[PDB]
Amino acid sequence: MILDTDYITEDGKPVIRIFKKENGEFKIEYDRTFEPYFYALLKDDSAIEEVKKITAERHGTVVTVKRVEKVQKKFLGRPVEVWKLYFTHPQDVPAIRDRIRAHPAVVDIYEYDIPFAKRYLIDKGLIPMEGDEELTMLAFAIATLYHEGEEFAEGPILMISYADEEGARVITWKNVDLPYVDVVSTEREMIKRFLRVVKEKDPDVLITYNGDNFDFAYLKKRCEKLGINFALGRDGSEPKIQRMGDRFAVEVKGRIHFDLYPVIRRTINLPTYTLEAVYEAVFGKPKEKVYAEEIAQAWETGEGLERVARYSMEDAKVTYELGKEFLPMEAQLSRLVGQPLWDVSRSSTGNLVEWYLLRKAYERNELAPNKPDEREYERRLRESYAGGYVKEPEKGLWENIVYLDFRSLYPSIIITHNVSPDTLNREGCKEYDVAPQVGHRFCKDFPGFIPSLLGDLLEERQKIKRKMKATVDPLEKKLLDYRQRRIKILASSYYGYYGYARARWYCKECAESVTAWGRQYIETTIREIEEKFGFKVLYADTDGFFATIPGADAETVKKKAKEFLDYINAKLPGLLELEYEGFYKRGFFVTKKKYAVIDEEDKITTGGLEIVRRGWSEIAKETQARVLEALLKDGDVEKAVRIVKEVTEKLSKYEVPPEKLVIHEQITRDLRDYKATGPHVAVAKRLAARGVKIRPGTVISYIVLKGSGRIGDRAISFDEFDPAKHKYDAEYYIENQVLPPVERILRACGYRKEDLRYQ
DNA sequence: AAACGTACGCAGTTCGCG
DNA sequence: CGCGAACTGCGA
Ligand SMILES: [Mg+2]
Ligand SMILES: [Mg+2]
Ligand SMILES: [Mg+2]
């Protein structure tokens, strides 16, 4: 099984390395024969002899064209004749390609920015993660000593914990009396012991949580200070940091560093993505969180450190368990895309589409379109198109609601109507499908490049979706649900890829065609259910809608809904299929993209509400949640009015714990690039002024105090909050935090909400 | 050296214009 | 002095 591929430079020549595990053995296969290349379209063949004399300089190396071959390929299906230019080293290509394109007889160049390792897997037809090979895994976490105003990793690592099938242990240089704790003398021994443990266990996969941005960068910095050669790799190398556009990733050569944070972030919708929230949201049991302040106090004073070591141990234990669960879903994602798990687990949805498209293009001998230059990239940003149809919600608290939606609206449209840039206005075509409103004709004679691949993706999703219900294990069922939904969004992002400014197969016409068809199909379904079946659509959004029969019983809504599905699915063509994905006792819809419904098992599902959004205090979230139960479950708005009256009373009488009045907002840039003043920006600019390190990603946890000025003037960080000297702004938390979210809810159900607050 | 799939949409905070 | 407008963060 192919784990990963890279290349090294041996005497000026690139050597591909294929890190494999076959028959329980780690293997490095070498390939000194693969040559980097890219293509060039020529005005005349005669120029090839003038082009191959073009040279360039690298880092003291004279880069020359090694070999050329004329090849016939297809560009968007139409045949084209390009010249394939070979080079010695892959870094020759970035050094020489602009000079080659600058030649007057060179129309354009192609496939010049493909990474050497990824190009190798594509051109050799190799697929990582294939085979039933079992992978050894070892998770690890670190616990550090931090103080405000300190540089990154200025203080030492206090604990290194690790966990596998043998159990979870903790290495630390203070005597903590626990059976799973190994005590050494200094931080240097603690690190060198952990390095020995990884060397002795030799795991194929190293699992972390945010190790790409914390655990590895911290270990790296501490290793340079203490002079430790952190030879984690199976080739003796140290962990290598890699820039991925905006943030950083860490690779360990020979192994797979599995950072669960990017994987979980895009697999589960959570308000926050702490390890405790993620663990509880998956396995059902809570996890205690120990913050850095209590860790520092326990270490410095020496009191209460067993609690810290148990948090460090749990950190490693639950990271290994989560890694066991989500490795299969990511291994399949690596097989589907055709790139190593390390890249697929962290890559953007954009490159997940493009890396598969590039592989399939090479299979069909399709010349890949380039990424746009600066002028075209900005032009694509300046252009947009109509999207999903959103209906203004019908006001009121409704009963006996069904939610119907398409199984995969946009991927259904792409395949059914052959939406593809190679089929767009393809002249000479016997039959086309024209999109409504936008009027783009799409050839139907041959399956388009992208539609020909979207089908297999959907067949995967339904293959996992069928195993989903057929698995009675709640854990394995929740995971297949996670995994089949990942494929749903992957296939849907193919439509969005058509509008991605950096997309090789960019097709604005394809994108707005898919949405125009989706708008026509969603409106047809709404119109049909209202005139032919007497339903009232209460809310609609892009791919689905809520509806009911006013004044009808629950049984006759379910029956007429199933009847309507038979009528509309026979009317709907191709792969378009409307689904029955829920009946709900009650529900309301406050605004576009903001709703709340409750099923027949009293389970409340919501969308777009302040409960799951950052920037609202817990006292606001908790009150809205309790108001949701009184309305959706009990149908008692007077209880909902009583709840908000109690909360506002406790706020006025200062009987609410200030821990519930903390607002969490994230800093998204350098504090200098802020055009406006805000509460969370004002605290960040004041903490940075006193020494605290603020950077893009820093969440500001603040609380608004009773004082003067704007809200930002009254806000302070919560760590600086002293209940003895500071009186929180009760009027703010009443009028600005608790009242607004429930006011809109009661107004949406048809209630004036008069005098919700206390006195 | 790759680099954020898309449009649609709400809403808190600030603050200058009639 | 209310009322958008800009800025800001993020949620099928
Ligand atoms: Mg790599
Ligand atoms: Mg655009
Ligand atoms: Mg049908």
Side-chain angles (χ1 to χ4, degrees), chain A residues 586-632:
Chain A
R586 254 180 297 240
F588 57 88
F589 317 88
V590 318
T591 63
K592 293 175 159 178
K593 318 255 149 154
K594 265 169 86 113
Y595 62 91
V597 296
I598 184 165
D599 67 12
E600 286 177 297
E601 262 85 32
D602 286 15
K603 184 175 290 93
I604 291 172
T605 55
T606 63
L609 294 197
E610 295 92 342
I611 270 171
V612 309
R613 284 185 137 281
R614 250 195 187 123
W616 268 279
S617 50
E618 148 80 353
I619 189 57
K621 306 202 214 252
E622 159 203 302
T623 302
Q624 181 179 75
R626 294 170 56 215
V627 154
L628 276 178
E629 259 140 14
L631 298 196
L632 289 189

Short mmCIF file of all heavy atoms in Angstrom, two decimals, chain A residues 586-632:
data_model
loop_
_atom_site.label_atom_id
_atom_site.label_comp_id
_atom_site.label_asym_id
_atom_site.label_seq_id
_atom_site.Cartn_x
_atom_site.Cartn_y
_atom_site.Cartn_z
N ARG A 586 -43.49 20.59 14.86
CA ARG A 586 -43.63 22.04 14.83
C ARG A 586 -42.37 22.65 14.23
O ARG A 586 -41.36 21.98 14.05
CB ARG A 586 -43.89 22.61 16.23
CG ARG A 586 -45.32 23.05 16.46
CD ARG A 586 -45.51 23.61 17.87
NE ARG A 586 -45.26 22.60 18.89
CZ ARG A 586 -46.16 22.19 19.78
NH1 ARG A 586 -47.39 22.68 19.79
NH2 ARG A 586 -45.82 21.28 20.67
N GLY A 587 -42.46 23.93 13.92
CA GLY A 587 -41.33 24.63 13.34
C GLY A 587 -41.71 26.05 12.97
O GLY A 587 -42.89 26.36 12.76
N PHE A 588 -40.69 26.89 12.90
CA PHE A 588 -40.86 28.27 12.45
C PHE A 588 -39.60 28.68 11.70
O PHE A 588 -38.56 28.02 11.77
CB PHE A 588 -41.15 29.22 13.62
CG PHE A 588 -40.11 29.20 14.69
CD1 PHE A 588 -39.00 30.03 14.61
CD2 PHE A 588 -40.23 28.35 15.78
CE1 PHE A 588 -38.04 30.02 15.59
CE2 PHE A 588 -39.27 28.34 16.77
CZ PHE A 588 -38.17 29.17 16.67
N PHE A 589 -39.71 29.80 10.99
CA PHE A 589 -38.65 30.26 10.08
C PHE A 589 -38.56 31.77 10.23
O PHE A 589 -39.41 32.50 9.72
CB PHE A 589 -38.95 29.83 8.65
CG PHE A 589 -39.46 28.42 8.53
CD1 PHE A 589 -40.81 28.13 8.64
CD2 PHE A 589 -38.58 27.37 8.34
CE1 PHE A 589 -41.27 26.84 8.55
CE2 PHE A 589 -39.03 26.07 8.25
CZ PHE A 589 -40.38 25.80 8.35
N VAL A 590 -37.52 32.24 10.92
CA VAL A 590 -37.47 33.64 11.33
C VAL A 590 -37.03 34.53 10.17
O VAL A 590 -37.64 35.58 9.91
CB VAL A 590 -36.59 33.81 12.59
CG1 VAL A 590 -36.86 32.69 13.57
CG2 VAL A 590 -35.10 33.87 12.27
N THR A 591 -35.99 34.13 9.44
CA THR A 591 -35.50 34.87 8.29
C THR A 591 -35.02 33.85 7.27
O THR A 591 -35.07 32.64 7.50
CB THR A 591 -34.36 35.84 8.65
OG1 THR A 591 -33.24 35.10 9.14
CG2 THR A 591 -34.79 36.87 9.69
N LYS A 592 -34.55 34.35 6.13
CA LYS A 592 -33.85 33.50 5.19
C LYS A 592 -32.62 32.91 5.87
O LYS A 592 -31.88 33.61 6.57
CB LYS A 592 -33.44 34.29 3.95
CG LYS A 592 -34.62 34.75 3.09
CD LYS A 592 -34.16 35.63 1.94
CE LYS A 592 -35.20 35.66 0.82
NZ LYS A 592 -34.79 36.55 -0.30
N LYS A 593 -32.43 31.60 5.70
CA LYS A 593 -31.30 30.84 6.25
C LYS A 593 -31.34 30.74 7.78
O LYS A 593 -30.32 30.44 8.40
CB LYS A 593 -29.95 31.43 5.82
CG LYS A 593 -29.88 31.84 4.35
CD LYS A 593 -29.06 30.85 3.55
CE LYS A 593 -29.56 30.76 2.12
NZ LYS A 593 -28.49 30.33 1.19
N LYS A 594 -32.49 30.98 8.40
CA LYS A 594 -32.61 30.90 9.86
C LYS A 594 -33.94 30.25 10.21
O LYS A 594 -35.00 30.87 10.04
CB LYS A 594 -32.48 32.28 10.50
CG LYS A 594 -31.08 32.61 10.97
CD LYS A 594 -30.95 34.08 11.35
CE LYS A 594 -31.36 34.32 12.79
NZ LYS A 594 -30.21 34.73 13.64
N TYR A 595 -33.90 29.02 10.71
CA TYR A 595 -35.11 28.26 10.98
C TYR A 595 -34.89 27.36 12.19
O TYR A 595 -33.77 27.23 12.70
CB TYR A 595 -35.51 27.42 9.76
CG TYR A 595 -34.49 26.38 9.37
CD1 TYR A 595 -34.53 25.09 9.88
CD2 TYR A 595 -33.47 26.69 8.47
CE1 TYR A 595 -33.59 24.14 9.52
CE2 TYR A 595 -32.53 25.75 8.11
CZ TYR A 595 -32.60 24.48 8.63
OH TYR A 595 -31.66 23.54 8.27
N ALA A 596 -35.97 26.73 12.64
CA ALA A 596 -35.93 25.80 13.75
C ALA A 596 -37.15 24.90 13.69
O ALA A 596 -38.28 25.39 13.63
CB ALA A 596 -35.89 26.54 15.09
N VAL A 597 -36.92 23.58 13.68
CA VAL A 597 -37.99 22.60 13.64
C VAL A 597 -37.70 21.51 14.67
O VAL A 597 -36.56 21.31 15.09
CB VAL A 597 -38.17 21.98 12.24
CG1 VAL A 597 -38.61 23.03 11.24
CG2 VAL A 597 -36.89 21.30 11.79
N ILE A 598 -38.75 20.80 15.06
CA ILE A 598 -38.67 19.71 16.02
C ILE A 598 -39.36 18.49 15.42
O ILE A 598 -40.46 18.60 14.87
CB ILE A 598 -39.29 20.10 17.37
CG1 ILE A 598 -39.10 18.99 18.41
CG2 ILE A 598 -40.77 20.47 17.22
CD1 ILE A 598 -39.35 19.44 19.83
N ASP A 599 -38.70 17.33 15.50
CA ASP A 599 -39.24 16.13 14.89
C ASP A 599 -40.23 15.45 15.84
O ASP A 599 -40.56 15.98 16.91
CB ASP A 599 -38.11 15.19 14.45
CG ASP A 599 -37.31 14.61 15.61
OD1 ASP A 599 -37.73 14.72 16.79
OD2 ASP A 599 -36.25 14.01 15.34
N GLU A 600 -40.70 14.26 15.47
CA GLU A 600 -41.66 13.53 16.29
C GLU A 600 -41.02 12.91 17.52
O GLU A 600 -41.75 12.45 18.40
CB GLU A 600 -42.33 12.45 15.44
CG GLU A 600 -43.35 13.00 14.45
CD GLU A 600 -43.96 11.92 13.58
OE1 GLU A 600 -43.21 11.28 12.82
OE2 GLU A 600 -45.19 11.71 13.67
N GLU A 601 -39.69 12.89 17.61
CA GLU A 601 -38.98 12.42 18.79
C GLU A 601 -38.45 13.56 19.64
O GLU A 601 -37.48 13.37 20.38
CB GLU A 601 -37.84 11.49 18.38
CG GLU A 601 -38.18 10.01 18.46
CD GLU A 601 -38.87 9.50 17.22
OE1 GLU A 601 -38.57 10.01 16.12
OE2 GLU A 601 -39.71 8.58 17.33
N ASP A 602 -39.06 14.74 19.54
CA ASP A 602 -38.71 15.94 20.30
C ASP A 602 -37.28 16.41 20.04
O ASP A 602 -36.77 17.27 20.77
CB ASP A 602 -38.92 15.73 21.81
CG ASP A 602 -40.39 15.74 22.19
OD1 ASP A 602 -41.24 15.61 21.28
OD2 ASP A 602 -40.69 15.88 23.39
N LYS A 603 -36.63 15.89 19.00
CA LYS A 603 -35.29 16.32 18.64
C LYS A 603 -35.38 17.62 17.85
O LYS A 603 -36.07 17.69 16.83
CB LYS A 603 -34.59 15.24 17.82
CG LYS A 603 -33.15 15.54 17.46
CD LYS A 603 -32.51 14.35 16.75
CE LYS A 603 -32.31 13.17 17.69
NZ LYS A 603 -33.45 12.21 17.65
N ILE A 604 -34.70 18.66 18.32
CA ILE A 604 -34.73 19.98 17.70
C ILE A 604 -33.53 20.12 16.78
O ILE A 604 -32.38 19.95 17.22
CB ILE A 604 -34.75 21.10 18.76
CG1 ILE A 604 -36.07 21.11 19.52
CG2 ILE A 604 -34.51 22.45 18.10
CD1 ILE A 604 -36.09 22.07 20.70
N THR A 605 -33.79 20.42 15.52
CA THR A 605 -32.75 20.80 14.57
C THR A 605 -32.98 22.25 14.15
O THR A 605 -34.12 22.69 14.00
CB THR A 605 -32.75 19.89 13.33
OG1 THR A 605 -34.06 19.88 12.74
CG2 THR A 605 -32.35 18.47 13.72
N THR A 606 -31.88 22.99 13.98
CA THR A 606 -31.95 24.41 13.66
C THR A 606 -30.93 24.74 12.59
O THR A 606 -29.99 23.98 12.33
CB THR A 606 -31.71 25.29 14.90
OG1 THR A 606 -30.39 25.06 15.39
CG2 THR A 606 -32.72 24.99 16.00
N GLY A 607 -31.11 25.91 11.97
CA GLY A 607 -30.16 26.42 11.01
C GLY A 607 -29.92 27.91 11.15
O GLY A 607 -30.87 28.68 11.32
N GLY A 608 -28.66 28.33 11.08
CA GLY A 608 -28.30 29.73 11.06
C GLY A 608 -28.56 30.51 12.33
O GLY A 608 -28.40 31.73 12.34
N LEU A 609 -28.93 29.84 13.42
CA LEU A 609 -29.32 30.57 14.62
C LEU A 609 -28.10 30.97 15.44
O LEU A 609 -26.99 30.45 15.27
CB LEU A 609 -30.27 29.72 15.47
CG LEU A 609 -31.63 29.45 14.81
CD1 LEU A 609 -32.64 28.98 15.85
CD2 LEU A 609 -32.15 30.69 14.09
N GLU A 610 -28.32 31.92 16.35
CA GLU A 610 -27.24 32.45 17.19
C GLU A 610 -26.64 31.39 18.10
O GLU A 610 -25.51 31.57 18.58
CB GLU A 610 -27.76 33.62 18.02
CG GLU A 610 -28.19 34.82 17.19
CD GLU A 610 -29.66 34.80 16.83
OE1 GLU A 610 -30.28 33.72 16.92
OE2 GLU A 610 -30.20 35.87 16.46
N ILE A 611 -27.36 30.30 18.35
CA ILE A 611 -26.87 29.24 19.22
C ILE A 611 -25.55 28.68 18.70
O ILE A 611 -24.60 28.46 19.47
CB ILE A 611 -27.93 28.14 19.37
CG1 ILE A 611 -28.86 28.43 20.54
CG2 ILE A 611 -27.29 26.77 19.52
CD1 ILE A 611 -30.05 27.50 20.60
N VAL A 612 -25.46 28.46 17.39
CA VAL A 612 -24.28 27.85 16.79
C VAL A 612 -23.30 28.88 16.25
O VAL A 612 -22.29 28.49 15.64
CB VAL A 612 -24.68 26.86 15.68
CG1 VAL A 612 -25.72 25.87 16.20
CG2 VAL A 612 -25.21 27.60 14.46
N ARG A 613 -23.56 30.16 16.45
CA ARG A 613 -22.71 31.22 15.94
C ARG A 613 -21.81 31.76 17.04
O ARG A 613 -22.18 31.81 18.21
CB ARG A 613 -23.54 32.37 15.35
CG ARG A 613 -24.15 32.06 14.00
CD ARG A 613 -24.86 33.28 13.43
NE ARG A 613 -24.58 33.47 12.01
CZ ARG A 613 -23.47 34.01 11.52
NH1 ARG A 613 -22.50 34.42 12.32
NH2 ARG A 613 -23.33 34.13 10.21
N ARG A 614 -20.60 32.17 16.65
CA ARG A 614 -19.71 32.86 17.57
C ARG A 614 -20.15 34.31 17.73
O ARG A 614 -20.88 34.87 16.90
CB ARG A 614 -18.27 32.80 17.07
CG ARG A 614 -17.36 31.90 17.90
CD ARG A 614 -15.89 32.16 17.60
NE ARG A 614 -15.02 31.21 18.27
CZ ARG A 614 -14.14 30.43 17.66
NH1 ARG A 614 -13.99 30.46 16.35
NH2 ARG A 614 -13.40 29.59 18.38
N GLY A 615 -19.71 34.92 18.82
CA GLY A 615 -20.04 36.30 19.09
C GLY A 615 -21.27 36.52 19.95
O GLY A 615 -21.67 37.68 20.14
N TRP A 616 -21.88 35.46 20.47
CA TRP A 616 -23.01 35.57 21.38
C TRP A 616 -22.65 34.88 22.69
O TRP A 616 -22.07 33.79 22.69
CB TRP A 616 -24.28 34.95 20.78
CG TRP A 616 -25.11 35.96 20.04
CD1 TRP A 616 -25.99 36.85 20.58
CD2 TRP A 616 -25.12 36.18 18.62
NE1 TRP A 616 -26.56 37.61 19.59
CE2 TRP A 616 -26.04 37.22 18.38
CE3 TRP A 616 -24.45 35.60 17.54
CZ2 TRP A 616 -26.31 37.70 17.09
CZ3 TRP A 616 -24.72 36.08 16.27
CH2 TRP A 616 -25.64 37.11 16.05
N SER A 617 -22.98 35.54 23.80
CA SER A 617 -22.64 34.99 25.11
C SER A 617 -23.46 33.74 25.40
O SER A 617 -24.53 33.52 24.82
CB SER A 617 -22.87 36.04 26.20
OG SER A 617 -24.15 36.63 26.08
N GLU A 618 -22.94 32.91 26.31
CA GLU A 618 -23.63 31.67 26.65
C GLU A 618 -24.99 31.93 27.28
O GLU A 618 -25.93 31.16 27.06
CB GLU A 618 -22.76 30.83 27.58
CG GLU A 618 -23.52 29.96 28.57
CD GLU A 618 -24.07 28.68 27.96
OE1 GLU A 618 -23.97 28.52 26.73
OE2 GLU A 618 -24.59 27.84 28.72
N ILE A 619 -25.12 33.02 28.04
CA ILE A 619 -26.42 33.37 28.61
C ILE A 619 -27.42 33.68 27.50
O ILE A 619 -28.62 33.41 27.64
CB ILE A 619 -26.28 34.54 29.60
CG1 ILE A 619 -27.60 34.75 30.36
CG2 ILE A 619 -25.85 35.82 28.90
CD1 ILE A 619 -28.09 33.52 31.09
N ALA A 620 -26.95 34.24 26.38
CA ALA A 620 -27.83 34.47 25.24
C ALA A 620 -28.16 33.15 24.55
O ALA A 620 -29.32 32.89 24.20
CB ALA A 620 -27.19 35.45 24.27
N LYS A 621 -27.15 32.31 24.33
CA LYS A 621 -27.37 31.03 23.67
C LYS A 621 -28.29 30.13 24.50
O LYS A 621 -29.20 29.50 23.97
CB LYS A 621 -26.04 30.32 23.42
CG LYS A 621 -25.01 31.14 22.65
CD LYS A 621 -23.99 30.23 21.99
CE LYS A 621 -22.62 30.86 21.95
NZ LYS A 621 -22.23 31.28 20.57
N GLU A 622 -28.04 30.07 25.82
CA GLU A 622 -28.84 29.20 26.68
C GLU A 622 -30.29 29.64 26.72
O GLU A 622 -31.20 28.81 26.72
CB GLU A 622 -28.23 29.18 28.08
CG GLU A 622 -29.17 28.75 29.19
CD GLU A 622 -28.73 29.26 30.55
OE1 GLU A 622 -27.60 28.93 30.97
OE2 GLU A 622 -29.52 29.98 31.20
N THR A 623 -30.54 30.96 26.75
CA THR A 623 -31.91 31.45 26.79
C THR A 623 -32.64 31.16 25.48
O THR A 623 -33.79 30.71 25.49
CB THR A 623 -31.92 32.95 27.09
OG1 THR A 623 -31.26 33.19 28.34
CG2 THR A 623 -33.35 33.47 27.17
N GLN A 624 -31.98 31.41 24.34
CA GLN A 624 -32.58 31.07 23.06
C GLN A 624 -32.88 29.58 22.97
O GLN A 624 -33.92 29.18 22.43
CB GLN A 624 -31.67 31.50 21.91
CG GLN A 624 -32.26 31.20 20.53
CD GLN A 624 -31.36 31.63 19.39
OE1 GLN A 624 -30.34 30.99 19.11
NE2 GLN A 624 -31.73 32.71 18.71
N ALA A 625 -31.98 28.75 23.48
CA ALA A 625 -32.21 27.31 23.48
C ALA A 625 -33.43 26.95 24.31
O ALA A 625 -34.28 26.16 23.87
CB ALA A 625 -30.97 26.58 24.01
N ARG A 626 -33.55 27.52 25.51
CA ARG A 626 -34.70 27.24 26.36
C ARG A 626 -35.98 27.77 25.74
O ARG A 626 -37.05 27.16 25.88
CB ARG A 626 -34.48 27.82 27.75
CG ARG A 626 -33.33 27.17 28.51
CD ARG A 626 -32.98 27.93 29.77
NE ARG A 626 -34.13 28.09 30.65
CZ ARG A 626 -34.35 29.16 31.41
NH1 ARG A 626 -33.51 30.18 31.43
NH2 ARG A 626 -35.44 29.19 32.18
N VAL A 627 -35.90 28.91 25.05
CA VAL A 627 -37.07 29.43 24.34
C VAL A 627 -37.45 28.51 23.19
O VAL A 627 -38.63 28.33 22.89
CB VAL A 627 -36.80 30.87 23.86
CG1 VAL A 627 -37.63 31.22 22.63
CG2 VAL A 627 -37.07 31.86 24.98
N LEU A 628 -36.45 27.88 22.54
CA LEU A 628 -36.74 26.94 21.47
C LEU A 628 -37.53 25.74 21.97
O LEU A 628 -38.44 25.25 21.29
CB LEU A 628 -35.44 26.48 20.81
CG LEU A 628 -34.85 27.39 19.73
CD1 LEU A 628 -33.54 26.83 19.21
CD2 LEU A 628 -35.84 27.56 18.60
N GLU A 629 -37.21 25.26 23.18
CA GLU A 629 -37.92 24.10 23.72
C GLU A 629 -39.35 24.46 24.08
O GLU A 629 -40.27 23.65 23.86
CB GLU A 629 -37.17 23.55 24.93
CG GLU A 629 -36.34 22.31 24.63
CD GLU A 629 -35.00 22.32 25.35
OE1 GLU A 629 -34.82 23.14 26.27
OE2 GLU A 629 -34.13 21.50 24.98
N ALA A 630 -39.58 25.65 24.64
CA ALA A 630 -40.93 26.04 25.01
C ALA A 630 -41.82 26.21 23.78
O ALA A 630 -43.01 25.89 23.81
CB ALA A 630 -40.90 27.33 25.83
N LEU A 631 -41.25 26.70 22.68
CA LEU A 631 -42.03 26.92 21.46
C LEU A 631 -42.20 25.64 20.66
O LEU A 631 -43.32 25.24 20.34
CB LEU A 631 -41.37 28.00 20.60
CG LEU A 631 -41.25 29.40 21.21
CD1 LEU A 631 -40.95 30.42 20.13
CD2 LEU A 631 -42.52 29.75 21.94
N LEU A 632 -41.08 24.97 20.34
CA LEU A 632 -41.14 23.82 19.44
C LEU A 632 -41.70 22.59 20.14
O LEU A 632 -42.53 21.87 19.56
CB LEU A 632 -39.75 23.54 18.88
CG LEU A 632 -39.24 24.57 17.87
CD1 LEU A 632 -37.96 24.09 17.20
CD2 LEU A 632 -40.31 24.88 16.84
#
